[PDB]
Structure 1
Amino acid sequence: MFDFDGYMLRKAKSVNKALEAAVQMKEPLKIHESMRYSLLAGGKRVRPMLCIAACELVGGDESTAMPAACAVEMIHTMSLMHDDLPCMDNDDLRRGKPTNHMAFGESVAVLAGDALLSFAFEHVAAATKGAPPERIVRVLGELAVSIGSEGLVAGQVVDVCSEGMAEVGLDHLEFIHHHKTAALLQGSVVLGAILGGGKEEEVAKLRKFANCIGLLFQVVDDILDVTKKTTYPKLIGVEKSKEFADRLNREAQEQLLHFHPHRAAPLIALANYIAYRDN
C-alpha cells in the first residue's frame, strides 16, 4: 500500500484519543494515575490496529471496534506492567522511563494492572455498540481465552519456569512464543472480525494470519540480534531461521487472499513490515 506508516500513525492517534477518554483520572487517584502512566505511554498500538483492521476488513466499522481495540491494549499494557515487577523481570526502566512499580510502588503497580485487566472486559461489555449481545459476549469469551492459561498467561508462565532449564527445544520455544505473543494478536484480530460481522470462514483465516505474524515477529527478532538462553538461530541457524520467516510471511499473506485487495492491504503491509525490519 502507499504510506503504511501514515496508516499506523492514524490508527494510533484515534486509539490514543479513545484510551485517554476510557481511563480518566479519579478516586482513588493513585490507582488511576498508575493505569494511565503505562497505558497512555504512547507506543505503536499494533494490537489495537490489528483489531480495527480486522473489523474494517469485513465491512466492519472502526467505531464498533474501538472499545475492544482499547481492551487489547489494556491487557498488553498490564502484562508489561506486571512483567517488569521485582519478583519477575525486575526492570527499573522501559522506553527510557522509570517502570510503573518504581514510580508508584509494587502494590499500586500490581493493583492497577489488575484494574486494567478487569476494566478490559468492562469497557468491551458496556461500551461496545453496533453489535448484538450474543456477538459481544462471544467476543468477550475470545479475549478471555487469549489471555488466560491457554494464551498470554500460559506463555508467560512457561517462560518463567524455563529460565532454569537451558535445554529448550524448538517445541518448547514455539509454545512460549505462540502463547506469550501470538495469543493476544490472535485475540485482537478475532475481535475485530466478529464485531465486524465476519463469517466463521473469514474469522478462521484471520486467526491463522495472526499466528503466522505472531511467530514471525519473534523469529525475525531473533535473526536481527545476530546480524547486528535459546533462539531460532541457535536451534536451526540463521539461514534456516530466515527460511522460516519467509514461509511465515508468505502463509500469513495467503490467509487474506480473498477479502478485498484494498481492505487487506494494511495487514499485508504489516506482515511485510514484520519481516523486513532492520531492527
Structure 2
Amino acid sequence: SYKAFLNPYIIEVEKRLYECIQSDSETINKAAHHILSSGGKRVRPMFVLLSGFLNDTQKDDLIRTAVSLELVHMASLVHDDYIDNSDMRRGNTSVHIAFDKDTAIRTGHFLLARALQNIATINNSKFHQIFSKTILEVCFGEFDQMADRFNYPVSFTAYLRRINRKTAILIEASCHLGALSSQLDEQSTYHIKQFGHCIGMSYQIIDDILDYTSDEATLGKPVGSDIRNGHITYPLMAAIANLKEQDDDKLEAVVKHLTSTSDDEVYQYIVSQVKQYGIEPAELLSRKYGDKAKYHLSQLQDSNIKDYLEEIHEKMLKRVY
C-alpha cells in the first residue's frame, strides 16, 4: 500500500522534522515538540514525495521540501489555534494553553523560520516564487475569512476562494514543489498540480459538511462551530437556497441578522436546517472536485505511484464516496 512504499521516507522526514525544531531556547523547543508530537497524518509530505516519484530521479531536495511544507503547515496551526481560541488539538492540548500566548506566537514564527532555513539551500527562484506565493495566498484568505465573519451573504465565488486559500493551495504547492524538485514533465506537472487543488477543495468541503453532520467526538469541538464563530459555508448557503425554493426565507432572514452575540437557540435552528436541506448539495459539490481529481490522475502515465495516489483519493474522500 501507500504506507508501505512511503514508510522509509516518512520516518526520514519525521527525523529531520525533529532536527529542525531543536533550539538553544528551552520553551520554544518544548513548544515546537508539543505540536510536532500531536497526531498528524503528515498528508502534505506524502503528496510531495509521491509527486517527485512520478518520474525517475533521486534528489535530496525532494525529502527536504516535504520537511518544510510540514513545518509551515504546523506553523499555521499554532497561530490558528490561538486566534480561534481552539483549546484542544486531537486529544492533546494546544500550545497557547499549555504555555502561553507569547510562546504560541513565537513558536509559529519559529517554525516558519526553520521551514525557510530548510529550503534556503535550493538555489531556485521559481521554487521560492511558488512557495512564497502560496504562503501569501493563505494569509490573504485568512484576512477575508476574518472580515466575512457574521457578514451575510457570502457569494459562492468568495466561498470557493476562501477554502482554496485555506486548504487547497498548500496541498497544491505540495504537489507542485514536489514535482519541481524532480524536473517532472510539464503536462504531467499540470495534472498532479490540478489533482492537488481538487483533492484539497473536496476535502475542505467535506470538513465543512462534518461541522454540521458529525459529532463533537470526530470534530473535537461542538457541532456547528463554524456558524457559531460567524463562518458562512456552502452547506448553509445550499440550505438557504433550497428553503427559498419552498418559498421559505426565514433561514435567510435569521442568518442575515446573525451577530457575535446571537443566542444558542438561533444556532441550533440553523444547524438543524442545514442538516435537513444543505448536506446533499454540498456532498454533490465535493464529488465534482473528487471526480475532477480522478480525471487528472487518469491522464498521467500508468505506474505504481499512480496507484498510491488513487488509493489515498479513496480514503480522504470516503465521506462522499
TM-score (normalizing by structure 1):
0.86
1:30 deviates by: 1.7
What does 1:199-218 correspond to in 2, within 5 Å? 199-218=185-204
- How far does the alpha carbon of each residue in 1:79-112 deviate from its partner, in whole angstroms, 9 at most, with x for none? 0100111xx2112221122211222221121112
CA RMSD, 1 decimal: 2.3
Which residue of 1 is the match for residue 282 of structure 2? 241
Residue ranges of structure 2 left out of the alignment (5+ in a row): 215-226, 239-277
AA aligned opposite 1:141: Q
Q: Deviations over 1:162-210 (max 9, x none)?
A: 1131322222211110001111111111111000111332222222111
- Aligned residue for 2:85, secondary structure, equals coil
Deviation at 1:48, TM superposition (A): 0.8
- Contact kept in structure 2, 1:79 and 1:113, CA below 8 Å: yes
Contact 1:182 1:210 in 2 (8 A): yes
Does 2:47 align with 1:50?
A: yes
Asked if the contact 1:249–1:272 (Cα under 8 Å) also holds between the matched residues in 2, the reply is: no
Q: Partner letter of residue 106 of structure 2?
A: L
Matched, 1:117 2:103: no
Question: Does residue 1:160 correspond to 2:146, yes or no?
Answer: yes
- Retained in 2: the 8 A contact 1:208–1:252? yes
Partner of 1:21: 19
How far does residue 269 in structure 1 lie from its aligned partner after superposition?
1.7
Cα shift readout 1:214-253 (whole Å, capped 9, x = no counterpart) = 1100222233455543333322333332222222112112
**Structure 1 residues 60 and 100, CA, compared in 2 at 3 Å: closer, same or farther?**
farther
Query: Residue type of the partner of 2:97?
Result: M
CA distance in 1, matches of 2:88, 2:128: 32
Is the radius of gyration larger for structure 1 or structure 2?
A: 2
Distance 1:113 1:44, change over 3 A: same
Written as runs of structure 1 = structure 2, the 5 A alignment for 1:128-167 is 133-134=123-124, 137-148=125-136, 151-167=137-153
Query: TM-score, normalised to structure 2's length?
Result: 0.75
Q: Structure 1 60/239 Cα, relative in aligned 2: closer, same or farther at 3 Å? A: farther
Q: 172, 187, 193: which is aligned to 2:158?
A: 172
CA distance in 1, matches of 2:59, 2:174: 13
- Between the aligned partners of 2:101 and 2:303, the Cα distance in structure 1 is 48
- Structure 1: distance between partners of 2:295 and 2:13: 28
> Tell me, which stretches of 5 or more residues in structure 1 are unaligned?
none
In the alignment, what sits opposite 1:271? Answer: 313
